[PDB]
Amino acid sequence: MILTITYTQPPATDLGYLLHKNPSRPQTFELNHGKAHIFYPEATSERCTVALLLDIDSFMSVAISRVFGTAMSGKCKEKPELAAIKLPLKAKIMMLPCKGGEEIIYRLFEPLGYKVDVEGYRYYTVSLEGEVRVRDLLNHIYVLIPVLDIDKLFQHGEGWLVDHPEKELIT
């Protein structure tokens, strides 16, 4: 499956510092039973988009924490203010299998303040757009993706999970 994240606040290339991954340097990570590729299809002052493509042979969550580890912690040494604030962000998850249909997807992400779009073909493409922190976009995806198929949930459920109408399903 694939994850993209798009940010357009000029210098949109700041997403590079926030994710702690240089736009000019595509990279591959060897995982348990598969590869993760990361690159930025777009890295200008107007638009910046990161992609993380999973090649296999929960895995995304693993890939997300392996690749976007420091961003998850909430830290950005070079732009401490952008890490700290809600940014206008778009994210896309392509080829997400989900037994519970699209209704459970809306049910997990809408409560978090995301405008949510679901496209089916059974795999899904989910589009999210909101004003959230980097670390919270990543945390949500990291926690909810597996649910759609306790320390983790403790560390990454932080400051959103308590007020979640589906918090018990998630738990």
Among residues 10, 41, 100, 165, the one that binds a copy of itself under rule CB under 8 A: 41
Residues in contact with 157: Cβ distance below 8 Å, sequence separation at least 6, in sequence order: 139, 143, 170
Among residues 14, 36, 42, 112, the one that binds a copy of itself under rule CB under 8 A: 42
Q: Does the protein bind a copy of itself through residue 2 (CB under 8 A)?
A: yes
End-to-end C-alpha distance for the chain, whole angstroms: 24
Among residues 10, 46, 55, 122, the one that binds a copy of itself under rule CB under 8 A: 55
Comparing CB distances to a copy of itself, the nearer of 29 and 160 is 29
Exposure class string for 42-63: b at 16+ Cβ within 10 A, else e: bbeeebbbbbbbbeeeebbbbb
Query: Of 78-117, which residues contact a copy of itself (CB under 8 A)?
Result: 92, 94-95
Q: Does the protein bind a copy of itself through residue 25 (CB under 8 A)?
A: yes
Quick one: which of 78, 70, 53, 40 has its CA closest to 134?
Answer: 70
18's tokens? 């926030």
Contact residues for a copy of itself, defined by CB under 8 A: 2, 4, 6, 24-26, 28, 35, 37, 39, 41-42, 49, 51, 53, 55, 92, 94-95, 119, 121, 125
